[model samples]
Target chain A: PRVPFLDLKAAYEELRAETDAAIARVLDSGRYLLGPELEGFEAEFAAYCETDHAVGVNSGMDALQLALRGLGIGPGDEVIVPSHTYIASWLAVSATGATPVPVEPHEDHPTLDPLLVEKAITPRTRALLPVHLYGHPADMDALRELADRHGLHIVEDAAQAHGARYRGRRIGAGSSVAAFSFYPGKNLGCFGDGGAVVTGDPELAERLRMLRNYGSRQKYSHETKGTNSRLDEMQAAVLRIRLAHLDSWNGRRSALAAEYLSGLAGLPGIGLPVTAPDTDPVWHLFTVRTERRDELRSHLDARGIDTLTHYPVPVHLSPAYAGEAPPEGSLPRAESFARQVLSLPIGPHLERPQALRVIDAVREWAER
Target chain B: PRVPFLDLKAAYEELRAETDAAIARVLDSGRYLLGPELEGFEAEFAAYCETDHAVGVNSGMDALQLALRGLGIGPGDEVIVPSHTYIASWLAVSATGATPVPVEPHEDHPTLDPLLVEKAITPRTRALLPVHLYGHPADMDALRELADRHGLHIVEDAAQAHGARYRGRRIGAGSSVAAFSFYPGKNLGCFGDGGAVVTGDPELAERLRMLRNYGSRQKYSHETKGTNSRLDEMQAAVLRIRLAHLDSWNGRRSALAAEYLSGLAGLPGIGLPVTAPDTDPVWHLFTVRTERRDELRSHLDARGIDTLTHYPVPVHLSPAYAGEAPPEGSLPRAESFARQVLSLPIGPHLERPQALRVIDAVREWAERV
Candidate 1:
């Protein structure tokens, strides 16, 4: 049996009738932009995140960028971020005209090292953006302590962790503001690009509503200069329909992750994905570590097992940030993880047969 | 019988089945943003405009903003705009970090006056944005002549001119790159906010596509800093279905405009909508002029005839551009038109009875008010 990465189409197949009906209803209403659909989704999504409010925007990058800008982070200010992850995380910081300062990851998870984060901070550091890479929740308790000590604001990049938890609180829920993306492949995804910032701050939510709409709650009024970015009503409608099954979908992803973890233990030169005791992960991708990553990936492909690299280059290393690359040895763990890490197929869509086939293929290769 | 300006919900009732199906189809496809729907609509719209390509964005404002940016417009560049038009034309130019140097209108029609536009031009001027306001085509011949005499690009703000014609060519067709909005009440409107840039230049279209999608034609490669501004597939799908009937819908509007003109003509103080012999208009709004506009509007309201001020203020005079307001008498025609202009009920949905009632109301008010 073929084991491929998650089938993006399976999501639609599972909820066709409900989602289609929802979309048709909105269309028939003769309202498609910033109307009832967007507002309804925002309220429901906020409730799902266990937050007081949610502000929907164009993309995950816009969610973070606007959040920073709403907090008055601009040029001459600094935002501390992980040295490794999607370039979008760092790009969001740059979009606000603030300089992004990178800190190296810890050896264990290689997501973010609180100690290194503190060392990297300076007086100008305005916000701490810790990404929940690979749907694994960062050590928020430690980071919260670190933020309090440093007087820095916390804006967790919960882009990957839709159902992930930190200290029994959902990654997106609780007191702090968190940005989430419903990019097509995310655990909870809209049909197209959709994202939001869920927070307890009502003022921030209201401000976002205005900021995304040309600085006017009413049309043609510009109290402030703002870049236009909004989540269309169609995307919002799709998200609301899919949102009904998010927890169940995340449950399936967790089950598949368990199958991968149990089957891949004791493999040579392999480091399994780790989760702390206090966390519940949604497993956006099952990224594992091995020195012969390229060889293992080739072996898997030959056996019809598809895999991927979560990120080969950290945002700091991209040519787009030529002058902004982190200094040498700043993030040794992230750099090492970048080279050795490989993501295997893991999602709600993966069948048991496919998972077993993947395991058998990996086991055979390891013995050889 | 009551007549209101632009009866959008009435058209919605007639086309509800087809529009609903289109929206459901997009949802079922599980591709709501850029998918087959947007692709189909872009191709169809581009063909409709007789242009090489079309790139759809979130709103009409974005259509002008991105098109200007695609033309390499930025902070140092200036675009000539009619000071008397809606603020969106000025705002679209401002969105590109470019300056909008306003030229006053030559006539009361409120389209660009090419002679004044030439007088407004400087070395910094990059483009000419002529608005086809209220479905009337701007003077493309005069504007085109000025463009050849002085090197400058011309982009039409075709927001109101869905089926309008200029020099026997469709408003968005031919060599000019034009921007349009499918706002819910436009002649060829989608249910929500949507806009497009139709261009004969393939390279400009490609650049616009990239700019709308975060400056990368291929995902994850940031060649330039671009952010999201997209037309959702649902809106695109509805627009595709709506396109088939746009001309007929526009024809209905034109008929109502004709009825209003004949029935309300020769009445004192009520001015008829004008036409420049070079173009055929779609009559997006049937705006009339009167010195006693407020009392006339109240009289119409008493007779159950609805009317609206197309704009109560010129863009530069609005609070959004308070810093950029033209001095008194700079745009005399626009200022007078702003005060006198009142739109009558007109749309595909408006019936003969409604138009007649509107005419009766206006005639009654014109004689006594």
Candidate 2:
């Protein structure tokens, strides 16, 4: 199957020794949870994003859950989410006994539209969760203004935009609590499942630490009803090691994306990843749009190249939520975009020949 | 410190090459969660436990939570838990929105007492959780009798009793379900946080598969509310490699136990771990009881040996459960055990000199402290 959508294994082949060594060190340390490695990785990751601190937890879903729990958002409250995220966002809110009020993203890029958020607010609204859609920063200034006006908590889901920025400040810096995923496939990922809530608020950080570690900041002194959801020492150490190279890896992704833009210039019936000008996406994905997405993927597969639709089903159409009742097609843009979205071969490790082959395949298909 | 309570590094040193290779293989494979390693380890662990199937989750707590959720136990339900075990046991019950009814253990050991379980049962009680306290198998016969009579689910807290046997059957085999912890210090442990549920019911097994994942047995298809709690492929592979050697390691623990029993027998101030005749205990921890438990612990600490109390506070007596307002005598046996019980240096990898030193220290402390 000339080029693949992404080769995670290729990245590993280069980082194997370093990653394996990090894991081996953790195994040898004999401490599994809440150890030195987690602290080190948190510091490094937080500094990378120009934040005060990062608190690592079990998963990206957990990061959101902890953020909500930490920021004092729960039962009888509503948190606004993008109508078209991977369901983890909604599920995280649901897990906390809170309600997820879906707000539509901007038509072109699926980030929480600030104007729409203003209308989505109610007396029960507690937080504004503006997702950095497609590695593009949400309208932070407008969202912040709306949040301030409504006394809403702002928790930013930066799961995709690891190195993304808003108005020259890092995505996680200064204000909102930043939630990031380290799902082994994120822009900045650990060897296994990991995540963190980066924040400038010392109080939230303190609460997050307790929420992640069995509701106990001190051993045997549980403060609240928190469960076991912690990123282990092994994954933390692996993340610490990867933290050194995350920026460099993202840089390579940036260079490759520019190359793809030049290579696929003005192709027929194609629209590229519409990254906002204020944003700098890590190209965690190199998604493009086409009506013939499935057929194009098939063609690429036939040429020994592999690509994927970023999504085949929009969030409103997911079995988790939409299984109960049919969803409203008010997400016409999201549904249309979900159907047409295709991820090309782009990463830190895409070889020149692989890139050329992907280009040739796409050009041949476009010419036909 | 001359002796730590557990030694994960030593075990890794013994299986270094294999564990390193297992992790490397998983890393290179690019499939981190529920990959071949998880699938293979599940089969291997199931075979080890003599169960038809095993389901892996993020932690020991998740294992119990998923088991309860699988059995349709939630908000309005209640699970009876041992008052003497770790807070994690009660936390798991509460995680599913169910209440945990604290039932204290038997007078002889810090494990669930069947009669007390009978007394604790209410119409809301949906399950009975009996911890295999300190790797000693609970009285499965009596507990099972009560559970069968009441039509209740039995979820064995086998976190401590990984390879121990109850009567002739394995500790995890004869129950509604059993949850095991692989939290580094367990009898059988992985390099990271991990746990699994072993069960005989195939339907229960399938439900657990979804419960561990995001309620979708098939990825991306959510059938119910499930969280993202998964055993990483690398940890599973490491556990699979170590599972083969677990029984042999348990045999070594038993041998060391024999030596300690002979060495500390009939001491005026010390009470040793008591095992029922039918049970073959795994000895995850070797604890002794004494009125001067704190003094004796201090003595052992000064001797450059390390130890800890299994639990200093009863679950019902904890800050987390303070809302229940269980007074001092609410759980007489559990509170007494909490004050008197002290865990000595014990594990699968205890050295001969270290065990001898511990025995000598306890014998001296019994005579002196």
Candidate 3:
């Protein structure tokens, strides 16, 4: 294919020596878990986000689950989550034995609609979880206002929005707590699965630390029933290296996005992504919408361009949540987004010429 | 210290090139989780245990929890556990939402007494979990008889008994299912925390594989609610290199144990560890009991000889089990063992002369303290 959706190998090629050396250091040290690398990376990542603390865990799913658990949420409680986002955002809540109340996205936007979140609350409601779907920042200020009125905690699923900004502050900067994923594909990702919970509240951060490490700050003294979800030292070292280059890589993504927007301007029969005025998204995925999504995908494929659906299935309609989610038509907007959205080739490795070729193919089908 | 309890650095030093090369290969592959190394190690480990299958997980705690879960044990079900063992055994049962019923070991035994286990069974009892404490093989034939009579499942906590033989068969080899931890200090350990569930049942093995890797054979397809507990490639690669040396390491431990036994025998008031004739133990720790355990430990400490208490506090008395356990005097045997057991410095790395020094320190203390 002329343009693959993403090139993980190229991401490695960009900084082979530094990443390999970081891993080598971890191996030679003979310490693999909860070691210096995890400590240093947590400190560095927390500072990078301008947060008071960051607690590292095994995966992004674990980060969100432990964040909710640290806040004292459990069975019979409700956590409001996005209906249009990836399934992991909802699965995290379910893992805690809490019910995930689905709220549809904004009419024209693809993140949780704050107005709808207010009606989903019950006396059992414990938290508001907003996902920055496809790297677009959610309306945090609006969500925070609703959470404050109802005495709800806010945990941002910033899995895709690693360096994204909301009204000038970084997405994870101003929140009480936010979960981030370093799933080898994010803007600032580790080599393998890893994640963190960044927060301004020191007490919550401390609680999060105990929650991730078998519920004990001291060894063999478990205060609560906690599971093992630790970020390995090798992964932490790799993350530390990649985090330093995140802004520069995100800058390269912005450059390619500009070229695509200018090249495919005012195309027929397609909808381009529009950011809310409050968001400076990292463009984790450059997604576009069209009624002819399948046709456009075929045309691109035939012309040596690779594309993919950001998520072909909405969380509500997935087989995993067969009886738990509402009926199919209950979430029409989410279903429509699942069917119509397509991610064109976009990454730090994607060159302008490759993106331009994709633009020409997309425009040719748009004119058909 | 004249003799250290265990030298993990020495273990690495013995096989530095091979282990380092294995780790480097894994890092270069760029496939860390649920990859070839984990698969290869699982295959190799199962063969070593003479089991049909092995499922690698994040820790021994997860191994036991997933093993019970795969057997359909859950909330309100009671699983019998040895009160004298490490707290993780009880914690694993609790993590599965099941209640752990603590049963004390025999007056002379550090393993669960099969006769006592029968009296502890209730209609709510779902399984029996026995820990092979200190690498000493538990009386599994007797325990299996009791389990069969009660129609209960048996999950062996072989975290310490990696290469131990019970009645001439490897501990895991004869069991339907067993959980083994590869903690940094275990007999056969990995660079980091890891564990596996070895099982003779193919159906149960399949369930465990799904249980460890998020309930789906295929990615993104959830058949059941599963949590992530994976043993990554680097640790698996490291474990593979060390597994080959497990028997030799274990054999060296046996020789050191024999030296301690012969040297410390007939000393005043001190009780030596006794193994049943049917078992060939791996001597993970050389523990001796005495009313003067604390005094003996202090004497060794002052003389530059290091020793440790296998467990200073029994599981039933831990603050983590506040209301869950029986009253204090109800489990007297467990409490007595906690107060009296002391682990002397002995390992594959401890030279014979260093072993003699530890034995002399203990014998001198029994004569003085």
**Best candidate per DockQ, number?**
2
Candidate 1 chain B: worst-modelled 10 consecutive residues by lDDT: B219-228
TM-score per candidate: 0.89, 0.96, 0.93
As for candidate 1, its clashing pairs are B214-B226
Could you give the CAPRI-style class of model 2? medium
TM-score of chain B of each: 0.97, 0.97, 0.98
Candidate 3 residue A209 C-alpha distance from true site, Å: 2.6
Model 2 C-alpha lDDT per residue in residues A41-126, reported as the tens digit of each score: 88888888898989988888899988998878888999998876677788888888888888877866668878888998999999
Cα interface RMSD of each candidate: 3.1, 1.9, 2.5
Ranking under TM-score, best-scoring first?
2, 3, 1
Report the Cα lDDT for candidate 1: 0.81
Candidate 3 docks at the CAPRI level of: acceptable
Best by TM-score: 2
CA displacement after TM-score superposition, residue A72 of candidate 3 (Å): 1.1
Which runs in model 3 stand beyond 4 Å of their true positions?
A292-308
> Which tens-of-lDDT digit does each residue in A251-295 have in candidate 1?
988888888789988987778988876898888888888888888
Model 2: DockQ vs. true structure: 0.58
